[PDB]
Amino acid sequence: MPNFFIDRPIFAWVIAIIIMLAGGLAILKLPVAQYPTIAPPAVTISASYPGADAKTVQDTVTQVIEQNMNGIDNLMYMSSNSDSTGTVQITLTFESGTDADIAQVQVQNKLQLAMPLLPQEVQQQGVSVEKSSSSFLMVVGVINTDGTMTQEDISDYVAANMKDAISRTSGVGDVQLFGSQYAMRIWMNPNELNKFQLTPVDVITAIKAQNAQVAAGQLGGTPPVKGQQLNASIIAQTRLTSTEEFGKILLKVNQDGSRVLLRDVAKIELGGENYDIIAEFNGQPASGLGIKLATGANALDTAAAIRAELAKMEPFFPSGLKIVYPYDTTPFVKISIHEVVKTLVEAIILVFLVMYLFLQNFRATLIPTIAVPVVLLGTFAVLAAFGFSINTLTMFGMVLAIGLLVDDAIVVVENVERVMAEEGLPPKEATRKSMGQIQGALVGIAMVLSAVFVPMAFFGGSTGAIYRQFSITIVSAMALSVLVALILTPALCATMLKFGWFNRMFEKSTHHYTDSVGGILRSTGRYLVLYLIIVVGMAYLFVRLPSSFLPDEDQGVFMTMVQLPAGATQERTQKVLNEVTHYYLTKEKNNVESVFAVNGFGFAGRGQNTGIAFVSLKDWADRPGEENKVEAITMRATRAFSQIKDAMVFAFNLPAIVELGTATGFDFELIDQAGLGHEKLTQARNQLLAEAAKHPDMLTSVRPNGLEDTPQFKIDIDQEKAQALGVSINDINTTLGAAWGGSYVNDFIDRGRVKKVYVMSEAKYRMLPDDIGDWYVRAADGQMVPFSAFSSSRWEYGSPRLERYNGLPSMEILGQAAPGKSTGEAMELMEQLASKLPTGVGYDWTGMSYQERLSGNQAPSLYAISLIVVFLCLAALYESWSIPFSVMLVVPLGVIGALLAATFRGLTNDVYFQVGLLTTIGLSAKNAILIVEFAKDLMDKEGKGLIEATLDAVRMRLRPILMTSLAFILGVMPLVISTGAGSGAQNAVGTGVMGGMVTATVLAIFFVPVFFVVVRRRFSRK
Template sequence: MAQFFIHRPIFAWVIALVIMLAGILTLSNMPIAQYPTIAPPTVTISATYPGASAETVENTVTQIIEQQMNGLDGLRYISSNSAGNGSASIALNFEQGVDPDIAQVQVQNKLQSATALLPEDVQRQGVRVTKSGASFLQVLAFYSPDGSMSANDIKDYVNSNISEPLSRVAGVGEVQVFGGSYAMRIWLDPAKMASLQVTPSDIATAIRTQNAQVAVGQLGGAPAIEGQVLNATVTAQSLLQTPEQFSNIFLKNTASGAQVRLGDVARVELGADNYQFDSKFNGKPAGGVAIKLATGANALDTAQAVEERLKLLRPNYPQGMVDQLAFDTTPFIELSIKSVVKTLIEAIILVFLVMFLFLQNWRATIIPTMAVPVVVLGTFAVINMFGFSINTLTMFAMVLAIGLLVDDAIVVVENVERVMVEEHLDPVAATEKSMKQISGALIGITSVLSAVFVPMAFFGGTTGVIYRQFSVTLVTAMVLSLIVALTFTPALCATMLKQHDPNKPESNGLFARFFRWFNRSFDKLSVKYQGGVNRMTHSKIFSGIIYGAVLVVIVLLFQKLPSSFLPDEDQGVVMTLVQLPPNASLERTDKVISTMTNYFLENEKEHVESVFSVAGFSFTGVGQNAGLAFIKLKDWSERTSPESQIGAIIQRGMALNMIVKDASYIMPLQLPAMPELGVSAGFNLQLKDASGQGHEKLTMARNIILGEAAKDPRLAGVRPNGQEDTPQYRVIVDHAQAGALGVSIAEINSTMGMAWGGSYINDFIDRGRVKKVYVQGEAGSRMMPEDLDQWYVRNNRGEMVPFSAFATGEWTYGSPRLERYNGVSSMNIQGTPAPGVSSGDAMVAMEEIIAKLPDMGLQGFDYEWTGLSLEERESGDQAPFLYALSLLIVFLCLAALYESWSIPFSVLLVVPLGIVGALFLTFSGMVLFQNPNLSNNIYFQVAIIAVIGLSAKNAILIVEFAKELQEKGEDLFEATLHAAKMRLRPIIMTTLAFGFGVLPLALSSGAGAGSQHSVGYGVLGGVISSTLLGIFFIPVFYVWIRSIFKYKPKQQNHQEHVS
């Protein structure tokens, strides 16, 4: 192949240009993302039972739906929660690779059989099925800077005119609005109702009857009589529109003949349909819209589409209302990708400088450099065919590939230069001879290096998706590198290199003097190196002791290095959870959040841009005593000092727990590395009541775990991701007494539900939009237990009977939020590692605590990791198998390459020398810089695989040459020493090129630095140790193996091989 392109250089150029053109065209169409679609598909079922308690919702809604979800294809786990505000949410998590659209259809089909079993009020509210995760892509704040619009006006406009257009944007899975639209609110006065003998049921019936849309028909509708000339639509009663119209609804006539209308017994107003949330932006009343990403959608594309839709909506905003991005994950994605691109460019420059240092010829340096754009662009064209995006993982793979992809071209150029100098041939002849010498070696080395990364592509699950991105990208780059080295590089050598003139006087320029000094120094180093190798190969015991020590250090460092799934990143947002004591009012929660907002806007004003808060909502559950805030930090470029980093801001924010006495806790948190798998960084587990011991025992077990976790120095912020049990007032109806009084139990339930919980009756028209009508007791008639006595029901004799005649009450405790996991009651516990501790060590600490429960008399409780923690645990279990499989594939490739079962061992024995460096530098960085992101995570595992390949490549360069010299008749020791000396320069050159290529990763800062450090430290440490130790031990291992498995000359078989 090479011979053809040496004489057809234009053909080679055309192929290279076509590859680059394909890459350029591909780049313009490839999607950009932080990660590929890693998170398993999630389908969420949402239902509402107005006025129901958490226990009622769980028993009548959640469990009914759960029981129908059996038999779904690829279902991984199911989690659910039932809240005291009547809402139920069931999240079904599927295996990686399941089509989310098919999963959603299957869930909807299963739901059909459950719908008929649900309470009527739930069916009327509707049951929704969405394919979105739990975390938010963006949160938009709508507010009035000049205060000209009220909070209700803003929230109504957002509900009526913003939420629906945004929900139709491609990629949006769900839109959640913090605050309701306008609703017709009918506030009942129990005293007036009792005096006029009107019940809530009377009012509901009257509204349904008199606020209805009636379809009458037509005048002259077909079939008509002969000669009919008129056709007109007939209209009658329609939906009411104003509070005055509702106040005029007729209820009854009194005994004296007077008419009783709704306005006589109730106050009617245009209010909000939801009073659960109070959202603010920088302390100003605001409406909030949270956007959740649809499963599998691209975050950047979706965010851009949302912005385009907002541009169309903004001209129609009311005077005085503006929008602001209060929370956005996409700037971090964009900056992290830009950071990796910058790293890639830096790597190319550094590799160029290293090549120039060793090749010492501008032409010779430019030739392998020209391979870079061809291979990089060609790789993008190929991975696009696999459906890959431009993301952090593929770009990391590109950075790793930079040092590897120039290796083949360097070998070609260096060998051509050597032949030209030693044999005084012209460039064409020298290139022809050189390619005959090294083409086989190039193919062999590339095959082995590619084989190292191939096993990663066949792993399943979430971890497999990450591995596959690295594997396919790296293998593609190396195969294209080989193709370029066999086609394009020889053509460039034949046309660009100049013939060596031995009589040409030496230049005395700056570069020439430096290169002469460098060459002399390197030659001296080579002589000393050869002497060191000679001593090492003859000192088997000394070499064995050092190698044994290396193996011991590897084992110790693997044990000491903490594990995690992905490094946490500074994503420019601090999410803060707020929890007040049980039964705290929304007003108290709002005051606490205001104090917290003022703290961040004043004390952290140099680092904080804005604060968006919601009282009444949190990821721990919906309730008046819960709150949530998104603190948006300033750009990373403005936060370069240590005190401006997100970890320092969070640590200072923890002081709010000492300042604000009314809060149970205020918990500032980092966002998770992968938003689709959780809402905050740290660990996440479900404590399960596997034996059905009940809520009290489960709570006791949870509290013991929380108490023990608070004492453990490895843990921080361990908390229940839910709400504490709260006092609840239980109404006890004496059925016998009610029956004796002639009172219907259905009437009692209906009255309590409408008076205390509120009831959705039907709809009305407000400015052309359909909105809801609610009936509920006036606030003053439902504040205290004794207020129940203000309410009356009508018996079967038409008499008004007070509740005190048949009902009593008592205070009990109950949970405002009940959880289930895989069909059993559970409680979610979350937490973060202490500073300097990895998530893996924190998970081990939690497992140790839970294992003590039986010793405390609490048997029958189990736990399961979920979300990001589940992925971390599964990825850790796969890593040893991945390493072993990669080594096995390398061994088999080497055996085929050398036609020997023994020689591959001399290559594989070198691998630990690279791994020890990767472990040592990563562990040292973690300890010295207190950087918990330097752990045994997915990126570090990829770095280890890269180090395996690099170590094997260095060994192959010496082993193959030593084997050739030995086959030519040289003594084992002489052949080994000769090979080591001859291959030292290319090993140092290619290793430095690779090392400097990854150096920008280790030195990176800003967005995405955590993941770059994980890869950079591991690879850089492996490069250093595999070179410094490997160049001495590779000859030793070759001598060991060849001494154990005696070499047998094959001259006698030469003719057979030719035949």
């Protein structure tokens, strides 16, 4: 092929131009996201039962909707919460490849048949199913700056004039709302009420009638009378639109003509739909709006597009409100991608400079500067053709293989300057001999390199979708390079081919080395050992090294997680958030850009006693000190904070895969498999929990990820008593409920928009248990009766957050490995400790733990098949049942040094290293090939020496190595190794390749001809 193409020259140019033109055409499709899609599809069903409580919300709703989650395909497991905020959330997780759109339909559809069985008040609130995916593009903020507006005011504007605005833009596949929008509040007053002999029911009953929307007819339309002439719509009663139209609602008419209004019995302001999240930004009231990506749209464009749209509305922002940006996954994705592209165009500059310094010929150093920027540009098209996107993973994906597609340009244009040199032919004639020694030898490295990369695309669930990212890019970049190295690179060597400070130094230095090999080699068995010592060093080196997923990189932001004890309230939570808000803006005025503090949401459930604060920082250029990075600021902060009252306040950096599985720990579900109670199970949990610390050998932080029981106030309506008074259960309940939990009566039209109307007791008549005092309900005989007449209340314990795994009630507990021990061996001990627990209690493994369990560890199992296909592949390249074994002995050479960056740096056995590991095993086998080939070739062809050929090969093969192998290191060493800006993952690739490439070349130059001569001699010997 290459021979009949170095004749046909401008044809190779065409091909090269298509690849360029298509590869470049694709650069211009290609979605760009920080990461690709790597968590299994989840569908969260979630709903509200205003003023409920964990139990009531559970036995009334959660059980019901889950009792109905049947006949749905590819469901992996089903977990669910039911907390005392009236909130139920159910999360159905699905198998790896399940189409998220069918999964969501099926759920939703099955849900919509459960609905008739849900309590009326929930049906209206509306249960809602969507596809959960914690990957946010950004969270804009809308703050008022003068003090005109409140949370709710700011919320309303955002959800009124600017939401759909975004929701209708490029990319934006979702818009959420950091606040309410208004609702006709109607805040009863048991006192201005027990007077006019009225309860909230009467109040409810009125609002319904005086704020409905009645149909009438037209005039004619439907069958009219013999030749009518006028036809037009009647417009009967239709909804209130003012607070005053509300206030004006007629509630009571008693003898003497008394005009009892809604105004007279309650405040009738306008406010938030819901009142327990207090989101403020840098101290001021705020109400942002969080946007998720799309499905094939640039995080860059549909971001640069969001800021445009935000500019258009910016004149019309009345009073003093401004848009703020406390979260953008863009400044990160951008610099992380402006590098890589740099790392790439630099490693270019290198293969030109290690091409002068070895070849002088400028026309030479100019051929790979047309070869690589083609294979690169070109593998982009192959990416876009497989759905793949430009992202943090698929990016380093190529970088990590820049060494392999370089060592295909150098290698080719080598032989045409080794052969073309010594007693050599003209260019066209010599290229023909070059590709005959490398021709067959390359279309063998291709297969050999297909394995050791393909078997990576086949891994588990979560991780292994990542691995695929890496696998495909590389096997694509790789195969597409060999494809230039047979089509264009040769046809380029001819018609282009015909050093002051080195020249002679290498002339003798080749010879100093050429002897070193042959020297002591008369023993031969010399380095067969020392190999065994380096093979086992590695094995000791391996087992020792810590395992991990992704370098926990400093991103833009991070967050402090504040959690007050049991019955602590909103306000009391705010003060704790104010110190945080302050400490950051104050003892950190140089790094902290903003503190977005939300009083209400927390990690492991909501409540007035939990908070979260998102701190976004100044741009990394402004944060120069390494003590001005995040694994530094948190540590200072974490401790700085460990001096507060009842208030656990700690800070942490979110993992690099935001929408993915945390730590390298476990996620253990404790399940209830007989009628055994919450109480009965809580014990069991403690049993196991206790039994867990009595083993500090298998880490700490074996924590329950829930909430402990708390006190609750129980009002018990005596039935008998209710009967003898004219007092009806429903009338009792509703009053209690409506006053204290508050009810959603119906809808009304404020300024062109539908909005809810809530009706709930004023704040000051519903704070303390001694406040029931004031609530009177009218008996059907006519008289206002007091609650103490027909109730009797007592305090008691109860869960405010009930859990369930796969139908049965559950308690989730998680914990970490063991500073010493392995993630797997931790699970086993834990399971064992489950075995001893009371009869009727089980355990299940979920999330990352389940994610490991079912995906097992395939590395050995799988790379058996890789290896077996490398021997099998290699035994064909060479015509031999034996020789291949002279190449496979190079696997280990790379591993040490690669591993030996356990020393020089303190890192982990992580994904960005393991592929780095593979790239190294890559060139190491590829040097082992051309050397074992060159050896065999001019020993089968020119019948040269059993050992004499071994020298006239490792010689003829030396320079290429030294060239590329240098070019690689002096281009894998820039900000890749020692960084600071989206670093981590960068440092990660480097060190595995860097050293380990050292030991790969600066150690194979001696060992491979050892490998070759030790083989052969043993096969057919006696």
